[model samples]
Target: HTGYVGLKNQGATCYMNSLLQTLFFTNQLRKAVYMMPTEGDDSSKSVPLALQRVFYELQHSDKPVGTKKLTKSFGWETLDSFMQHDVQELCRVLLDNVENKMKGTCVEGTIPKLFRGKMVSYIQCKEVDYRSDRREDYYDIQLSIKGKKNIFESFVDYVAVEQLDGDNKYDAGEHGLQEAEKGVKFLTLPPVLHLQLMRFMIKINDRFEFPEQLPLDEFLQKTDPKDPANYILHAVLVHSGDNHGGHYVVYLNPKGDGKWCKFDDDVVSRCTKEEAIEHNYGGHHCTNAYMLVYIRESKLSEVLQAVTDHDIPQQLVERLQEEKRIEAQ
Candidate 1:
């Protein structure tokens, strides 16, 4: 294996991987925009410049940004709240504090911004217009990968989505996902197919607990009062909506179905929720999996259309179709 790309189902991963590889080779580079929704009611009051700097510094330092320095810089009483919403602020405060410690000294290609310390070759800036439903005037760090060694040279792969039926039209006719409208579901499958999917759901949950990192208070919220013993630490949630959007890696829908899909430009979105203990992936480390759900769709026709347009491998597509069919029968 030249790379490590884990998908609960490999068939979907491989198919998506092909699209990514081709796009990169052809110079049809992907652009990822991290906007905190500047216009909506979600204002950025909770986020401060000091926080964005923390993630920036952490990425450059490749180490955990400590609470002592962050608390000192941001004027937080303790590391708990700091830890709660501190990563970005930590960066901003750390940078300013370091510069202050240097007594008006400055560095090249770097300004003493919120959390990142005194350094060069990296400039941390805020997205002035961005806002989110959660907060406004809030900040989001953007990582643009084009023409950069750190991003360009990196290996890129993706996880693929596998259809649940084996004998369905996708598998049998080698076509894309067909409408399975009937019953309570807009999409219907055979009884065995449903059972197989249920089995997969069981297996994935059994193999690994869906671990979410969270502060003590948030952690307690996710607990089921009735079944305190069986902590729903790990979970797979499937989602379906009239409007299909991105796959959020943090903070599940609270209401979602647990189907699987590939991670693509339109489908991929990451967030750091209050519920989980933060972990870093790519340059962004999240607080925890506490509120996060490993989600995908059981029936999103547009997703299948996107897969086809992206040029998924026929064999893998066939496999998903077959799986769908078996489920239908």
Candidate 2:
């Protein structure tokens, strides 16, 4: 069951390595990327193309991958800048770039649906009128923890914006000059949920711990209370040191067997749930967990099915067939 692969660090490319492992473990996203048709003379260079290649290598290769070529495909001003880039920023850029690369090709394979979900904002005007807006989709859920304790409390505090002054308080129409109360909630849950723990802060360095397990059925707006909204922790990206400087590592449960592996650049080792949870008790300036990856229990089977049914390219299929024939003789 030790099927997870590791990524080699390219100087400060640990940020990219941690994020790549998280996306690799997300089976639905991997399948979607695999289904996308590759183009360009050097198709293995772009974000979408790099992902498809790296994902295939992760499943089939016995050695760690070097991501210098992949990062170069991102078209950064210089290679050095990408090496030290933020993980959260890189995650957004990668997803957006992948979508752009696959634009106008196959509608179904464009944006991975695992990262698609809606954010609903319910607002009440000062005039006692209520209005609500639904944002179509999101790549990840950003949880702010300025004063909260853990992820759950932070999320609760995030959606509970009480009677705050409106930014449009200077408007002239009837909807103008309203003091509104805002409540945010999830309209739908994606197959895979990417939760970003905002640990870095301005002026003060802030840190918070995450639970081993995060429940979403209670937090969702339209989900049935009776149904299970369980989201199990599958992967975590950890940063060691302060915001200005740190190394990135990933802890992932690829086999869903509760056994976790730490992918620290080119190094890979076995880890425990207790060891993973220790990062949650941050505040003493140590290696702390940053981004958390969770998948819905209900959709786990569907994603696993996609992984088993993933298609191999015809060229590789022929190559494998030739190897098998040679071995048979």
Candidate 3:
């Protein structure tokens, strides 16, 4: 046994189950959810409250847990829950709900603390003292995979410079025509990074590789030896569906012990490390990575602190159990 249980798919919510499995296993997120003020919450209607229950079930229960309450919190009707949905959308939706709920609570910034990042785009003219940088906050990085041979190649393209050598250089700016450079650099990287590989890029069937341990120092601007930007892969959201249809499952190394396991709906199986990385390299009738979860190596100790009975809210757990007991009767 890999010490992990499976999640039951409520109708066609396999993508939702697959996505939540990774999040629940990530100790950082699990503990954070438990921190939310769920004292007086209506378990079925409160997203974070419902989430805490689900996470707790996955942590302690040895059976397949259902996502019924979690889905109900989203106002997802029977049809809404069954219809095909995207995990990317489900993530934003659930996190958005949790963020909204934590607005004035103790864990107001907890969600952002794990996933938020800052990036700035620079437009600098070579001949003039004119340069402007626009800043935007990111929760996850959505990377394009078309024409890219590897994840690093996709990242390089993301931060690639587009030079304005001729015309648009001085089109709007007060400064005269001058060769300028335009590009972006990350100011802060998220502690728990989620990289969504756009699988729709069918510049189809090409070999694309991904590194197990990725160093962001090479891509980041400026140097900080004290706080490293190195990240270790924690989970991979895999897609095996092709052409008009597909399914989602996740292979995650939750313990950070180099042990990987595939969590499909109602089935969890142990897998080799190479089996996790090699099979998803793209360009085959095989499972490919649709999303990746990485934890900063420097913060690994804190991020994977191990969610335990001490961390989980016993009050919420009891209430959920009572409700389930009543329903079972």
Candidate 4:
């Protein structure tokens, strides 16, 4: 109970609550966020700054805290208008806002280092340096669910090669008329990789599934071919109900302890890895994953050790105790 915190939903703020839990469980991100000095004015609020305060309260407050100030600081007109918003989009905005605010601070540009990684577009052409031509930083991988049944398959599809020319091709060495092949590959991998399952397609009732542990070394365009890129699932944000109306809940494995916990707004309960996997393989009436949080296996021990050292605020300890007592009856 001391390991997790509940959020008080501000009407249609389930989307926000799920995201908060997801970020809270991301140890490196949370630690860096809290490290930023408190220097913001009362008139302005940044996501990182608000998160600093929110995380403090979440650890320190006895009861669930409202995110009205947090959301309002991000320029939401009214809380009701945020009802049933896209979690991925919200995540983008939050990250961008936080990064913007953190600029000029001592921890400026720190979030990207933790969450951002690069993908290179390889063009099989003599004129172009495949690695030098096109590259971009990605905070999350937006995977296609068309034929991917698992995380590995989706990652494969993400870096799959593509033909760059027409069916009729000229000689291979010909400069202008020859066909070319292009492939995408990961140039770098982040400490924490965020995988977002695109499940917002209309008229398509299909569901996507992924493995509990994702092996990603082969998927990377490794500088050293032998380097490992293993990752384990730490948190997932699941969406329930329909596209127009839905609720969000988070399933987190605090500190990679292998014990997954379900956080549905103000309620926290123990859950199984199988239950999390089941949600990934959604059914007609079951919940589906919207966002997934993965942590590097090599860094898991360090992150967990830091988490173990974290002290649960006295207020939260009492609140968790109360919840436990009520549940016993």
By the TM-score metric, which is better: model 1 or model 2?
2
User: Which stretches of candidate 4 lie above 4 Å from their native place?
Assistant: 79-85, 104-106, 125-132, 166-178, 203-205, 223-227, 304-329
Sort by TM-score, best first: 3, 2, 4, 1
TM-score of each: 0.18, 0.83, 0.90, 0.81
Worst 10 contiguous positions by lDDT, candidate 1: 187-196
How many backbone clashes are present in model 4?
0
Question: Which candidate has the top score in lDDT?
Answer: 3
Please, what is the whole-model Cα lDDT of each candidate in the order they appear?
Answer: 0.23, 0.68, 0.80, 0.70
Candidate 4, 1-329: lDDT as tens digits: 65566888667775788888887776666666665544434523655566766666665567786676687777765656565466777878887866776678766876787788888775675444332247877888888877677777888888887765566543444355555566778888887888878776662336677767788878765555454687888888887776467777888887787888888888888888887767557856757887788887877765544642254334433543554477579
lDDT of 1 by residue, 1-329 (tens): 11112112222111222222211111111110011111222112322222222222222233323222223334555424432442223434433433343343222212212112111121111222221111112112122223322211211100112233435422212334442211110111110000001112111211112223211112121333432311121122221111222122222212222222222222323333322222311222211111112111321221112211224233433443453377579
Question: What residue pairs are clashing in model 4?
Answer: none
Residue 152 miss distance in model 3 (angstroms): 1.7
- Model 1 segments beyond 4 Å from truth? 1-47, 67-69, 72-75, 79-329
Q: For model 2, what is the alpha-carbon lDDT of residue 95?
A: 75
Alpha-carbon RMSD of each model: 27.5, 4.5, 2.6, 6.2
Better of 2 and 3 by lDDT: 3
